[PDB]
Symmetry: C4
Subunit: 388 residues, 4 copies
Amino acid sequence: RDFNNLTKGLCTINSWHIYGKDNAVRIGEDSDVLVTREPYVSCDPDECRFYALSQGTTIRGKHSNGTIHDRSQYRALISWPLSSPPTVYNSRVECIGWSSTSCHDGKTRMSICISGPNNNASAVIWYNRRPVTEINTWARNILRTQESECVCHNGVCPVVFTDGSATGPAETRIYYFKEGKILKWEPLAGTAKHIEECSCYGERAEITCTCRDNWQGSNRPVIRIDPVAMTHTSQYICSPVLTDNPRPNDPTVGKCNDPYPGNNNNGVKGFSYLDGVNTWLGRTISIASRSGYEMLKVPNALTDDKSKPTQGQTIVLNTDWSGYSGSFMDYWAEGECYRACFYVELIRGRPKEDKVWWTSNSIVSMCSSTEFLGQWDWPDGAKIEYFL
Amino acid sequence: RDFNNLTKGLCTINSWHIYGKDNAVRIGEDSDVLVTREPYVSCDPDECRFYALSQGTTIRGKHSNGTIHDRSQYRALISWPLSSPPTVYNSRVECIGWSSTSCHDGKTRMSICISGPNNNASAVIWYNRRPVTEINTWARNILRTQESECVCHNGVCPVVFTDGSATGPAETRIYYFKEGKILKWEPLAGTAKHIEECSCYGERAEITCTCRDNWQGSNRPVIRIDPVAMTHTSQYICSPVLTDNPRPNDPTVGKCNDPYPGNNNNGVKGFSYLDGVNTWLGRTISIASRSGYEMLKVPNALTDDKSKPTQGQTIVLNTDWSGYSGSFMDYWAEGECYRACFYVELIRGRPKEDKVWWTSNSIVSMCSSTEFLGQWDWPDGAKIEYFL
Amino acid sequence: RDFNNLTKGLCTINSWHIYGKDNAVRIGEDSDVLVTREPYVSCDPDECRFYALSQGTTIRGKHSNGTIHDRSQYRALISWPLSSPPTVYNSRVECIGWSSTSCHDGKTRMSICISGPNNNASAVIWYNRRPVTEINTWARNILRTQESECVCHNGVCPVVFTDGSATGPAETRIYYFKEGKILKWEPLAGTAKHIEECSCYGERAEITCTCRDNWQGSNRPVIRIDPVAMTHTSQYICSPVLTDNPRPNDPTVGKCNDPYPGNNNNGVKGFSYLDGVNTWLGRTISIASRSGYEMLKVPNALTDDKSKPTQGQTIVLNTDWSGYSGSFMDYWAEGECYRACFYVELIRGRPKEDKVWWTSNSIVSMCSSTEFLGQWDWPDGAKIEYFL
Amino acid sequence: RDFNNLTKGLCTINSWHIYGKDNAVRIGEDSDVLVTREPYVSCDPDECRFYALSQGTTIRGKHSNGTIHDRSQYRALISWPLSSPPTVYNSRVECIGWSSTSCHDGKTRMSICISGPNNNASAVIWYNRRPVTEINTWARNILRTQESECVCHNGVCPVVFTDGSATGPAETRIYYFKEGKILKWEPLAGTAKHIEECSCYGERAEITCTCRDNWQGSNRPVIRIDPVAMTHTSQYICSPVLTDNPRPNDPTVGKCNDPYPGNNNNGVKGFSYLDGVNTWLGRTISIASRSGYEMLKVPNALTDDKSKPTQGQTIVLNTDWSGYSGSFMDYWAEGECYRACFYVELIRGRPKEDKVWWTSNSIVSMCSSTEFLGQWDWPDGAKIEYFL
Ligand SMILES: *[C@@H]1O[C@H](CO)[C@@H](O[C@@H]2O[C@H](CO)[C@@H](O[C@@H]3O[C@H](CO[C@H]4O[C@H](CO[C@H]5O[C@H](CO)[C@@H](O)[C@H](O)[C@@H]5O)[C@@H](O)[C@H](O[C@H]5O[C@H](CO)[C@@H](O)[C@H](O)[C@@H]5O)[C@@H]4O)[C@@H](O)[C@H](O[C@H]4O[C@H](CO)[C@@H](O)[C@H](O)[C@@H]4O[C@H]4O[C@H](CO)[C@@H](O)[C@H](O)[C@@H]4O[C@H]4O[C@H](CO)[C@@H](O)[C@H](O)[C@@H]4O)[C@@H]3O)[C@H](O)[C@H]2NC(C)=O)[C@H](O)[C@H]1NC(C)=O
Ligand SMILES: *[C@@H]1O[C@H](CO)[C@@H](O[C@@H]2O[C@H](CO)[C@@H](O[C@@H]3O[C@H](CO[C@H]4O[C@H](CO[C@H]5O[C@H](CO)[C@@H](O)[C@H](O)[C@@H]5O)[C@@H](O)[C@H](O[C@H]5O[C@H](CO)[C@@H](O)[C@H](O)[C@@H]5O)[C@@H]4O)[C@@H](O)[C@H](O[C@H]4O[C@H](CO)[C@@H](O)[C@H](O)[C@@H]4O[C@H]4O[C@H](CO)[C@@H](O)[C@H](O)[C@@H]4O[C@H]4O[C@H](CO)[C@@H](O)[C@H](O)[C@@H]4O)[C@@H]3O)[C@H](O)[C@H]2NC(C)=O)[C@H](O)[C@H]1NC(C)=O
Ligand SMILES: *[C@@H]1O[C@H](CO)[C@@H](O[C@@H]2O[C@H](CO)[C@@H](O[C@@H]3O[C@H](CO[C@H]4O[C@H](CO[C@H]5O[C@H](CO)[C@@H](O)[C@H](O)[C@@H]5O)[C@@H](O)[C@H](O[C@H]5O[C@H](CO)[C@@H](O)[C@H](O)[C@@H]5O)[C@@H]4O)[C@@H](O)[C@H](O[C@H]4O[C@H](CO)[C@@H](O)[C@H](O)[C@@H]4O[C@H]4O[C@H](CO)[C@@H](O)[C@H](O)[C@@H]4O[C@H]4O[C@H](CO)[C@@H](O)[C@H](O)[C@@H]4O)[C@@H]3O)[C@H](O)[C@H]2NC(C)=O)[C@H](O)[C@H]1NC(C)=O
Ligand SMILES: *[C@@H]1O[C@H](CO)[C@@H](O[C@@H]2O[C@H](CO)[C@@H](O[C@@H]3O[C@H](CO[C@H]4O[C@H](CO[C@H]5O[C@H](CO)[C@@H](O)[C@H](O)[C@@H]5O)[C@@H](O)[C@H](O[C@H]5O[C@H](CO)[C@@H](O)[C@H](O)[C@@H]5O)[C@@H]4O)[C@@H](O)[C@H](O[C@H]4O[C@H](CO)[C@@H](O)[C@H](O)[C@@H]4O[C@H]4O[C@H](CO)[C@@H](O)[C@H](O)[C@@H]4O[C@H]4O[C@H](CO)[C@@H](O)[C@H](O)[C@@H]4O)[C@@H]3O)[C@H](O)[C@H]2NC(C)=O)[C@H](O)[C@H]1NC(C)=O
Ligand SMILES: CC(=O)N[C@@H]1[C@@H](O)[C@@H](F)[C@](F)(C(=O)O)O[C@H]1[C@H](O)CCO
Ligand SMILES: CC(=O)N[C@@H]1[C@@H](O)[C@@H](F)[C@](F)(C(=O)O)O[C@H]1[C@H](O)CCO
Ligand SMILES: CC(=O)N[C@@H]1[C@@H](O)[C@@H](F)[C@](F)(C(=O)O)O[C@H]1[C@H](O)CCO
Ligand SMILES: [Ca+2]
Ligand SMILES: [Ca+2]
Ligand SMILES: [Ca+2]
Ligand SMILES: [Ca+2]
């Protein structure tokens, strides 16, 4: 009916409670579950759904061979009911492509899928499930976007894209859409030196995105967007609690305005909630690989270059595989505050488990509680030996 | 539109007619049916559905091995259309966990799932399909709840939980929720010495729950809740017709205010309708194992310590497997009275049928008739040899 | 919104056009299609659906063995979208049992399922998808009903039941329901000597049912019901064009008020439209077995004991299997007249094709045209050898 | 609510962006995907869907053997959600037959299916999902229609049919339907000598159809219909850019009013958008077989017998299989102009890939952009060796 406005602050995060989990790889061992990766969660005013990029084959299907590859003509953004698995029969295709974002503005949903060969990709922006706008590649090198939900305020839904090198300077743009049309775009500004796969959330008329500096940084760049002024800033999380992967060991002092060095030309999509003392960071447990996942309460991580954890919660054990992670909230919930949520992609198969010829994932997702809840760990749960 | 009020009495129960049956194990021999256990039935104002705890794998799936276990990260409360089986493609996840309850208040549904390791479990209370409240374990020993529907009156939906030992005193609480928020909770009072898995129904502004004393009692404890005053009482069914399992042979006199002794540290979820002469008790036929199921009309069972059956109906033959059973009613039906209903869980596989490596169930459910109807028996119907 | 009234006459039937066909046995060779038999079609004001009695297993499932049997605890009335097959995932259970009828009254649907052992069966009458009324067996010998849709007028939906012998006099009753409640019932009157499986249609405030005299008659009994007066009459179709199966060869003169003799203790559900010159009869082509199906225009068949065909249409070749057939119309269509429709059940498997251990069917259905359309034949289409 | 009127012109076509793709053959290797051919796309005011003719078996099913044949009793027009595959469980049958068209008039949808033996076929015209009108064969030789969407204006939906020889003069008629009823029909007029499988679109109260002259022409006939006057004209595309298949090499001058000769008794359904300088033609890349697909901008193709391409876009590489192609638009989109769209059928299996015994297809579909977007190619993507 009316466009949603970001009028609330974050609820106090004292722990994380289980929100959804689809067990897709367990179930897909013997049912028609699509191979996916790059999953996320996003809410409409009346429903919240799981999203991901299909690979256009089931996991048991012979076409699952080769699905380690990120980009093909067979990928599409799909959505499906919360905590069900992405099956052939219940998955709704939002648009065709191999990089995506999607968000609801309070009236209807915008979905964006990018497709094409590496040197000639284009984004199509869908609004109310019809294509409205198209954007051609500007740097001819894998035009790509968030892989988790965008955020809207009064109809304005900013979206971060990158086109150019994954291993040196690239051309990142912030587009401000409304009803699927471009109001404005700007080149990246501020002190973030490289941006990929931004994870975003909105509170009190500001949108905060935690991104991946693939080039040099093991601290995460942060873009903050004013969706009214349609302007932004960028920096890094100051905290020495480093949250990319792979990454070096944690130091005692981080960097606010430069990449924290040690690891080049690699990373993983991740996220954080940056809200003064109410600040929580996600990271893999392993510094070397996408294994384990934990949440750490790091008061003032964004601005305090010596901030260390005051509390934490393990999400996935270090003996279990993790993957991309990202933020979403139910902007249409009851109550006085927005409840922070996140998902973690649990990647199975190649390259770490190469006795199968496929790569897929399942999803686990949590939201914050004002209680101090007991923790469990939440592995994918599938036995790779069953697929042999 | 408005909250439902328990304004009607029970219809006269003169027999039981078949209401629903999903044949899940028969069908799941060759289709994508999820492994479940702890099923139940619950109605919305416009639909009634089957509910259960998924095990996050199909029955033919290789992950069905090990599903005798009650608690894993792969379980969730699911619902699906009445008398269909719980399949991968038609099952709707209500929330994630390994103990649950759910009920509709006339406006929308509350669902509660508990998850966690044994010493650190938490309940999440969902209302209008969003998480609202969380409750951490208080005794650090398998926080657990009804495994069948709760009941609401004017928006107040009491729920019984237990945390603590299954084989000695435990800490049982009655929470009174409204819109997913805690109005009040109380510790168990009265003469029931141990409470698990309460089966509840509502009539004339009172809610009656028939529970399982796992510790000492082969008679069933009964909690009666006034959802206006938000107060309760507890006792046992007085009747010598004993209704837990396993249990000793029936005596001639029961116990009103103490466990009837003979069997320790075991039991099964069960139910009854306690309404003066219109009183019917469910039980397994076998005193030793979860086989068979019958309904017995035991006038004044609750209050008369010498009451014996005046009528009965066999539901499941003693040569067929039964399991948990519980009560629900369609509070939104037409007419002057609430029609008592129940389900029986028909457990197949381990431990009684150990040539398969799984444990699952199907559901049969009946409601009362004012006629004296002919009886059939209603087995699960699957042939275990087909799964070998 | 308002109850439907039978205010229109039949459209002129000049031929039959294809309406629906599900190819269930072809498709079910390699997908999760339920075994059924006793199918039919029925319309709501906004949709028309296929109906049948499930056998509670898929066709490829190992539980399909033994499905020649008519009555088990695993059967249910299911419905599913027009011309789709009855699958595990798209079939909606209306009620549990092994004999059924269903019709919409303009406001909501009534469905009736009978279940039980042979000597102790009961009907449950569901209205607005809730059980309302129950009827116990009166003759203790397979209480059974139409196996095709009932018809309503101003909320009154008459239903024909039989209880008693299939091979001698039985006790047939016409119940007049409204909102699932019994307004009245009457014992069969008139000159029909035995009634089973009535096929009904309504026009100009009268309901006509064409039934099966299993005992002695190879002509079909006809019940005509006034749903306002709640009274009926019965006789036989006068025509020498005999329409039961098996049956003797056609004579030159039929019988109006007695069974036409020659074949005892057998028959098949069938139907006709009896409307003066606009009269069409269905029958199997074979006099000996359920093979082939044809429509014959037999002016005044009901009343003229020498009436012979003036036109016809082959529906199923004599080299293809047929089965039960029955009538329905879309009472909520546009226009000035009700368009006659019918289905034919195409039975596959046992007893005629005994290299498989199952029995199932698919459905073909046609409606009348005022054109003189070209005919095709419409076989089930499945290859039994594929199932070996 | 009101009938749609064709009040807009075409948007400027500067390139084509990906719209939908179902990957049906890849997915159907290991899931219950129906065999189809003759697919298309059509929109309702609130949804756009894929359509095709089922063959009434899954691809892995043993009944897929023999599905090279165009006409059987097992075919039906089905629809399913955009970019999902046509599965047993999500496909909605529109009507039964082996040639079809369908379109929405702004109020509800008309669907037309033709069935029958070759010498005795009939069309049934469905409106608001009920049969309304029937049309018997007039030339007794495979009555057949568009195999892609029709177009409506103020309730009038013209439809082109052909009955008669595929290899000499035939009898083509334009029927003008409204609410499923025949307002008028006319025989083909103008200079087109043979018409099959018209692909249509509407703009500014005129409907343009690009058809297939199977008899003599390798240029495509064009019918232009005034749906207010209910009159039409026909000619050929003048352009030497020849767009049927198979076809001779392109000359320098085409023919406006006669078939361009070179290839007899063959062709493929195809389409074009004819709008002065904004004119784009589809064709296979190969002159000999249904391989590859490209779009060429050929200003004034309809009227200029020397027009050559000024721009183009490859859709499918010449090393990949193509098939039928056709036009549709979303008439209910926002904005000032109608966005041209098309699909291409990607045929797999027989006759070109005869190591499998089946023939099926997947779908790819694009719509126009006012940007000059980078191109990719969009193959079916399935590996035939996996099906062996
Ligand atoms: C039932 O469930 C409940 C609820 O979940 C469970 O309770 C939870 O238990 C977990 C596990 O213990 C806790 O998570 C950890 O939290 C600590 C932070 O809390 C500690 O420190 C606080 C701050 O201390 C500072 O200030 C205070 C005064 O302000 C001062 O006293 C102190 O000296 C210091 O200067 C303390 O306030 C806090 O105490 C409070 O809480 C206690 C309960 O935990 C209670 O006992 C106290 O009385 C008091 O109330 C407490 O001491 C996190 O630091 C920790 O995270 C580190 O460790 C894990 C490994 O366990 C690691 O994975 C993390 O990455 C992180 O450590 C790495 O990073 C650091 C920062 O750079 C670095 O310093 C470390 O060396 C280490 O780095 C290495 O590994 C990383 C990752 O691989 C790598 O990248 C690096 O390169 C390097 O190799 C955990 O998050 C929960 O907070 C707690 N929750 C609650 C509500 O209590 C309960 O256990 C369950 N019950 C059962 C029976 O199972
Ligand atoms: C078509 O369908 C219809 C409808 O379903 C079928 O009819 C049904 O038939 C069934 C099976 O017979 C009946 O169920 C049983 O009901 C009896 C209760 O009814 C009897 O007793 C009544 C009360 O008697 C007392 O009062 C009267 C006067 O008030 C006095 O005369 C009498 O002496 C006594 O003091 C009688 O009123 C009643 O008579 C009436 O109804 C008759 C019809 O049944 C009719 O003939 C009469 O004229 C009159 O109208 C009748 O006599 C239940 O007692 C019984 O349940 C016990 O038995 C089964 C085994 O069959 C068992 O599983 C139960 O658990 C239970 O027995 C155990 O528990 C007892 C209590 O503690 C204990 O005392 C027993 O020793 C036994 O305990 C052992 O086993 C248990 C369980 O394993 C274990 O835990 C213990 O430790 C121990 O080992 C049945 O429920 C239906 O009521 C009846 N329904 C109707 C409407 O009629 C019909 O059969 C079908 N037709 C066909 C052709 O198949
Ligand atoms: C394209 O499609 C079109 C449309 O579908 C196809 O045209 C259709 O063609 C079929 C097949 O031919 C026709 O079906 C048959 O219809 C006849 C009835 O029509 C005939 O008889 C009419 C009445 O005759 C009487 O009155 C007139 C004057 O009023 C008088 O002249 C006459 O002597 C007699 O006294 C005639 O009016 C009618 O003529 C009209 O139509 C003609 C077109 O057909 C046209 O040529 C004429 O000029 C004129 O306009 C015509 O002669 C049915 O009788 C017949 O059904 C019998 O036969 C089939 C076997 O074919 C059988 O299965 C049936 O059960 C039935 O025969 C059995 O039952 C009889 C009754 O008891 C019994 O008498 C028989 O001995 C036989 O009994 C045996 O078998 C049964 C069953 O196994 C068993 O139970 C018994 O015991 C015993 O063993 C067909 O239904 C369509 O009507 C026709 N439709 C149209 C609109 O034309 C066209 O063919 C297709 N084109 C192509 C190229 O394929
Ligand atoms: C990133 O993506 C972008 C966007 O997709 C990619 O850029 C696209 O690149 C493709 C491939 O190159 C282009 O498609 C072709 O377009 C040409 C038409 O454009 C050319 O000609 C125009 C008209 O020329 C005439 O007028 C001008 C002045 O008005 C005059 O100068 C000239 O001499 C002539 O008289 C030129 O205007 C145009 O130039 C413009 O654009 C250029 C970019 O392309 C730029 O460089 C220029 O500066 C200027 O701005 C350009 O020269 C089509 O002709 C062509 O289609 C033919 O060729 C393909 C094979 O490639 C074939 O399949 C087609 O069927 C067709 O050729 C057949 O048919 C002809 C007509 O009958 C016949 O003449 C031919 O002999 C041939 O016939 C044979 O094959 C067929 C089919 O098998 C058979 O039936 C016959 O019998 C016979 O055997 C392509 O469609 C895109 O237009 C271009 N898009 C854009 C926006 O730029 C970019 O490449 C990608 N980047 C990367 C890095 O990959
Ligand atoms: C899930 C898992 O086993 N993660 C381990 C993790 O438990 C650690 F032991 C680790 F050494 C690590 O990289 O931290 O290796 C991970 C993994 O073996 C990477 C190379 O294959
Ligand atoms: C479908 C079919 O083959 N029907 C034939 C039919 O074609 C006839 F040849 C028949 F002899 C018949 O009963 O009429 O036999 C039927 C069948 O063989 C019954 C005994 O098995
Ligand atoms: C898809 C494909 O391989 N198309 C080729 C295509 O690449 C060409 F090489 C062609 F020679 C052609 O017909 O143009 O043959 C097609 C095909 O082999 C037809 C006879 O089998
Ligand atoms: Ca990095
Ligand atoms: Ca006990
Ligand atoms: Ca008979
Ligand atoms: Ca041609």
